[PDB]
Amino acid sequence: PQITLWQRPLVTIKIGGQLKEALLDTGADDTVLEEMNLPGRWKPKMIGGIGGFIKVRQYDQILIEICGHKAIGTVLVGPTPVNIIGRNLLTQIGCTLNF
Amino acid sequence: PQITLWQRPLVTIKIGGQLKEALLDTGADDTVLEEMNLPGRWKPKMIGGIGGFIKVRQYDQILIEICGHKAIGTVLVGPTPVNIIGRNLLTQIGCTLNF
Ligand SMILES: *OC(*)(*)(*)([C@@](*)(*)C(*)(*)(*)(C(*)(*)C1(*)(*)(*)=[C@@](*)(*)[C@@](*)(*)=[C@@](*)(*)[C@](*)(*)=[C@@]1(*)*)C(*)(*)(*)(=O*)[N@](*)(*)C1(*)(*)(*)C(*)(*)(*)(O*)[C@@](*)(*)C2(*)(*)(*)=C1(*)(*)(*)[C@@](*)(*)=[C@@](*)(*)[C@](*)(*)=[C@]2(*)*)[C@@](*)(*)C(*)(*)(*)([C@@](*)(*)C1(*)(*)(*)=[C@@](*)(*)[C@](*)(*)=[C@@](*)(*)[C@@](*)(*)=[C@@]1(*)*)C(*)(*)(*)(=O*)[N@@](*)(*)C1(*)(*)(*)C(*)(*)(*)(O*)[C@](*)(*)C2(*)(*)(*)=[C@](*)(*)[C@](*)(*)=[C@](*)(*)[C@](*)(*)=C12(*)(*)*
């Protein structure tokens, strides 16, 4: 699709058989989702945003379907205000910015 | 132009005759630049992101040039770690997300 930015670019994602809403965020290096249960072991990671840093759990090789496009990569879980689809997955779905 | 997301999508902006570098951020509702002086009256505002909230100064009707394209809108100034071009101005230059 072609998404305009008059509103937040929210899309439905499916992870662990659940549907959630997430933001296509070109300003985000990584993907972070609100607290949830993900399979496997996690490694520690710190991410810095506008307000400062937070500690998140890092899971590798997670399948996530974004607007019906399957992607598999690293997903972080922590105290994020919204579910964020960052550049690591955007690139897997061939998303680009156009003007 | 068509911008890929292998790297952060950084562009050159021209504000108050000052030439700068900024991030095209679709995850950002507003535009926020690092501490600088704009002409006019400003209003205090609080914007929240990952890590919490920051206090910025809000200036209305500022002209910005993004990759040659002139755009007008509100510009926030504060302790942001990077200059960010949010949705309020990406819309003015006709930016869209495509996959
Ligand atoms: O884009 C980004 C993020 C976002 C998220 C969100 C959304 C919605 C709500 C909340 C949150 C943000 O923060 N946003 C915000 C809002 O919208 C309000 C405002 C904003 C912004 C601006 C203005 C206003 C952002 C970004 C920034 C930066 C960049 C670079 C560096 C630093 C900072 C962020 O944060 N990012 C980050 C990085 O890249 C790393 C990471 C990882 C993950 C995620 C994110 C991130």
Side-chain angles (χ1 to χ4, degrees), chain B residues 54-99:
Chain B
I54 52 156
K55 197 183 123 136
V56 299
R57 294 184 282 127
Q58 167 191 336
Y59 293 87
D60 304 311
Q61 290 170 198
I62 301 291
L63 162 65
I64 300 209
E65 185 133 35
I66 301 119
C67 263
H69 310 62
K70 290 175 203 40
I72 314 218
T74 297
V75 174
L76 314 181
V77 167
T80 173
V82 20
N83 293 315
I84 290 166
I85 313 299
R87 288 189 308 96
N88 77 304
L89 302 173
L90 292 172
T91 60
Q92 305 295 106
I93 71 170
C95 195
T96 69
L97 238 18
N98 308 70
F99 59 108

Side-chain angles (χ1 to χ4, degrees), chain A residues 23 25 27 29-30 32 47-49 82, chain B residues 23 25 27-30 48-49 82 84:
Chain A
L23 198 69
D25 196 339
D29 301 321
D30 311 303
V32 209
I47 55 148
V82 281
Chain B
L23 192 68
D25 193 336
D29 294 326
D30 304 303
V82 20
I84 290 166

